[PDB]
Design a protein around this ligand. Structure first.
Ligand SMILES: NC(=O)c1ccc[n+]([C@@H]2O[C@H](COP(=O)([O-])OP(=O)(O)OC[C@H]3O[C@@H](n4cnc5c(N)ncnc54)[C@H](OP(=O)(O)O)[C@@H]3O)[C@@H](O)[C@H]2O)c1
Ligand SMILES: NC(=O)c1ccc[n+]([C@@H]2O[C@H](COP(=O)([O-])OP(=O)(O)OC[C@H]3O[C@@H](n4cnc5c(N)ncnc54)[C@H](OP(=O)(O)O)[C@@H]3O)[C@@H](O)[C@H]2O)c1
Ligand SMILES: CCC(=O)[C@@H](C)C(=O)SCCNC(=O)CCNC(=O)[C@H](O)C(C)(C)CO
Ligand SMILES: CCC(=O)[C@@H](C)C(=O)SCCNC(=O)CCNC(=O)[C@H](O)C(C)(C)CO
Lengths: 477, 477
């Protein structure tokens, strides 16, 4: 019980002190995506930054061209107090990389090209409705939410030229503008911020409250349950659990399907438990294949839940190196697949819609920008779905033992050294069931050694995020 | 800043499980105050407990007579599943002890007489509007609120025959009744509960929100400020602070007034800071003297704030021993004085109405039932005043160093050994200002060693209260 409780953490937002009322002394550089500069919040921000602010229009996605343009600007215009990116407004998918929002691609390349050009002014990435901050906040853009995943990794990899992330309110009035320009002047060590009418909120990680025994509001598991990546490590273990809890029919998918290693043994396992088993080969980013799968479900066993476990973590790279192709391949099973899943099942009144995220999206991991972005999309999509009145849960896993991605010893060793320890599957799954019985929207489930993790995480840069974890605070004293 | 944040804690109420649907197997004993059994909620509870429930009418306040009656009842009727007290409905002040609500007197004597008689069934004390539980809840009876202070100490001193405290809703309908009889059957380890229309809530302690400059909009300190107990330890330090922050005129009161030890030095201190000082000898329970003090304030310096620091903690005693006389002397400067202060200033539109409480009222302290009751009144009165649209704050201090009650070394040693550490006055006052800047209604301000405190506090009995303090959870794991 308390073993599972100890695994569960929650992102929350605390009010922080009002900033000062002077705009920065030095000049700002504002980066705009020229075909996506029309949104009201972009206009309001440009107006708040004032006419002295230099504007750079980021056209297309050409790293070398931008580097040369930025170098010229630095030469001509001198040094900047900060760089303020409005590239998040470009939500349309990149025409050559169908799983990458244009704004996300352009933000990556901007971070690369600023380094290339030696423009060292701290980079601030602005979004509008990419987080749910404050009671009753509406996360209106899960695409912009992905950009926070990337941003946190930029802060780990380039801490000395990263400013942070600020989410703007729906209405950027004079209060909100003064709060924005104040933070850009000095942010008081905060770097993950939401501006809202009631004040300025900052992102915090906290222990979740211990499960209240006997208090579950989870519907019984029944009918058909789709587990994407269901032939993989965590997915198989999740499929078994669901079978024990009363699913009538488990639909497992993956690109390899019945050819996936271990698939024949997993099917026989599930059939011993008295469950119908369908194992289908198909890319979760393929909308038509998903539709066809849902259309052929038994009339006796309609879809009641989705567990999205499809994902890859390999072929990622440092921010300074990551290509748009590698980014696309990392986003595919996460952004594109989850969006299909959401759209195809929105009208089905599901009991559960569970997205498997990662701690790489909670606090960030160096070397894993694309994976962090892709999983940050899932967290944001769950908040978005709740605002529409749909069920959703995003579970950001730490490291599993025994099965799945993280059982390579070299990977394992790296993680244990950072203090992200391998969970026993029974404990991880038990903590998941607690989350689902509480009907939480988003949680991290992870076994930590804070005495290892906190000093490693904050070596280069303090983290206000962790100020609300007493073990982290205590490690750093 | 964050050091002062770390001193501040906040009582909150979280939803817990719906209880079961079976009435207790064994028979209940219901204790009623015969002249005060008319209230609607008392009738509704008696009806919910059903006709099999044995009734005991607690007449007067005679410990020995009740002990003999209870012994007879046990003889005749057997042992009981639990004892359900409805004595809180007696809000009228005791005829012989003008600071003691009759119900509070009778609850003490009941807890004493049950022990005397060897009735071991867990004692549950019911109240109606004695806490503010849930958003927009109205604490309508601060007198009944005092009973929760006493109750928590009964739980520390007699953990094996204490059930707990349950606050009923305004309307005890069938849902509320089934919730009550379900909790009496099995409370799932909870012992501080509120039944409301939306469900069952339980009492929780959390770290308070970090300071945000000017959020509660505290007005500037100005005009005349009354500090009762102003010649005493904390009071004098509070007077000094207010003088530094621009009070025009400090009115310090105590029973000894200008004869109080150190009073001539404190006057000179405050006057060096440019403040006018009035020191009056004045029992804060004397309504007429307080009225005369308020009537003589200059029109150029009207009353703007009250800081209620009057109080005694000595000559308390264990629950088993405490007399009504001792109880009266502890309640006097708290209940009676605060009530006068509330009534005489209700129409003055104060900027601040600040009551000095104790952690003895937050979580309880063995050997200090009378003090805990008296201070729990202050917490409840602050919530009550907020429901009326009046300003109020209750500050439940831990232990001060340097000045005041707790500076005796053997007392100090006992506290340090329980993990309640002595605060530096500047840090305690800094935390108070944070609380007043946020305009919080109730907070505890205390320096804790949770690794010492949690195991000592829960040695004999678990505490759900502390499950929401991660340092407590970690100490116990
Ligand atoms: N293991 C951990 O410690 C951990 C920590 C954080 C988060 N996670 C998340 O948990 C989930 C499960 O991870 P795991 O450890 O079970 O990894 P795994 O054993 O590699 O399983 C991943 C599954 O996703 C499938 N997949 C990959 N891309 C797909 C696509 N486009 N369409 C459909 N299926 C696809 C894979 O099969 P094919 O290759 O045959 O398609 C595989 O069955 C992942 O989303 C991962 O991001 C895991
Ligand atoms: N010190 C702590 O660590 C701590 C912890 C929790 C709570 N508190 C609370 O903080 C407040 C101040 O405590 P302290 O440590 O400053 O103790 P203190 O030095 O004894 O101050 C108490 C003051 O109250 C006065 N007083 C007592 N009964 C009174 C009455 N009936 N009418 C008017 N004045 C009366 C006393 O003076 P006379 O005797 O001359 O009346 C004295 O000036 C108290 O309410 C106490 O319960 C203190
Ligand atoms: C690679 C497989 C995978 O799922 C991984 C990326 C994840 O689940 S993330 C878990 C690994 N690490 C983290 O979550 C914490 C990263 N934190 C760290 O403390 C690193 O030392 C810093 C200093 C921040 C450099 O990145
Ligand atoms: C006596 C001066 C005074 O103000 C004191 C009573 C107060 O401020 S209350 C603070 C003293 N102690 C407490 O708050 C903690 C009580 N906690 C404890 O852990 C006790 O050891 C238990 C085991 C519960 C028995 O009472």
């Amino acid at each position: 019980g308390s073993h599972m409780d100890a695994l569960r953490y929650h992102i929350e937002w605390n009010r922080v002190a009002e900033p000062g009322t002077a705009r920065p002394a030095g000049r700002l550089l504002a980066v705009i995506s020229p075909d996506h500069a029309g949104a009201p919040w972009v206009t309001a921000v440009l107006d708040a930054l004032g006419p002295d602010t230099v504007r750079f229009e980021a056209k297309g996605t050409d790293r070398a061209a931008w580097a040369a343009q930025l170098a010229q600007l630095r030469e001509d215009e001198g040094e900047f107090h900060a760089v303020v990116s409005l590239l998040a407004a470009a939500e349309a998918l990149h025409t050559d990389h169908g799983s990458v929002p244009l704004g996300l691609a352009q933000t990556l390349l901007l971070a690369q090209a600023l380094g290339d050009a030696g423009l060292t002014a701290p980079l601030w990435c602005l979004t509008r409705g990419g987080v749910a901050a404050g009671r009753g906040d509406v996360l209106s853009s899960p695409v912009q939410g992905a950009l926070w995943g990337l941003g946190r990794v930029i802060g780990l990899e380039h801490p000395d030229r990263w400013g942070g992330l600020i989410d703007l309110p729906e209405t950027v009035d004079t209060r909100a503008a003064a709060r924005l320009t104040g933070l850009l002047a000095d942010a008081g060590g905060e770097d993950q911020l939401a501006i809202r009418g009631s004040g300025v909120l900052a992102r915090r990680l906290a222990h979740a409250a211990p499960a209240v025994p006997g208090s579950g509001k989870r519907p019984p598991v029944h009918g058909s349950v789709l587990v994407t990546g269901g032939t993989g490590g965590i997915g198989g273990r999740v499929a078994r659990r669901l079978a024990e809890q009363g699913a009538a029919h488990l639909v497992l998918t993956s690109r390899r399907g019945a050819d996936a290693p271990g698939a024949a043994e997993l099917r026989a396992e599930l059939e011993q438990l008295g469950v119908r088993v369908t194992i289908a080969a198909c890319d979760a980013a393929d909308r038509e294949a998903l539709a066809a799968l849902l259309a052929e479900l038994p009339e006796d066993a309609p879809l009641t839940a989705v567990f999205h476990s499809a994902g890859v973590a390999h072929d990622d790279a440092p921010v300074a190196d990551l290509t748009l192709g590698q980014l696309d391949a990392l986003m595919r099973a996460k952004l594109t697949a989850a969006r299909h899943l959401h759209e195809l099942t929105a009208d089905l009144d599901l009991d559960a819609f569970v997205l498997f995220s990662s701690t790489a999206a909670v606090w960030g991991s160096g070397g894993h920008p694309g994976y962090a972005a892709a999983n940050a999309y899932l967290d944001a999509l769950a908040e978005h779905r709740r605002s529409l009145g749909l069920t959703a849960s995003s579970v950001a896993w730490g490291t599993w033992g025994e099965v799945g991605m993280a059982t390579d010893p070299e990977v394992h060793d790296r993680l244990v050294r950072q203090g992200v320890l391998a969970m026993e599957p029974e404990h991880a799954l038990g903590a998941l069931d607690q989350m689902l019985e509480n009907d939480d929207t988003a949680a991290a489930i992870t076994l930590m050694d804070w005495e290892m993790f906190a000093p490693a995480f904050t070596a280069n840069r303090p983290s206000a995020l962790l100020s609300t974890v007493p073990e982290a605070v205590s490690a750093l004293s």
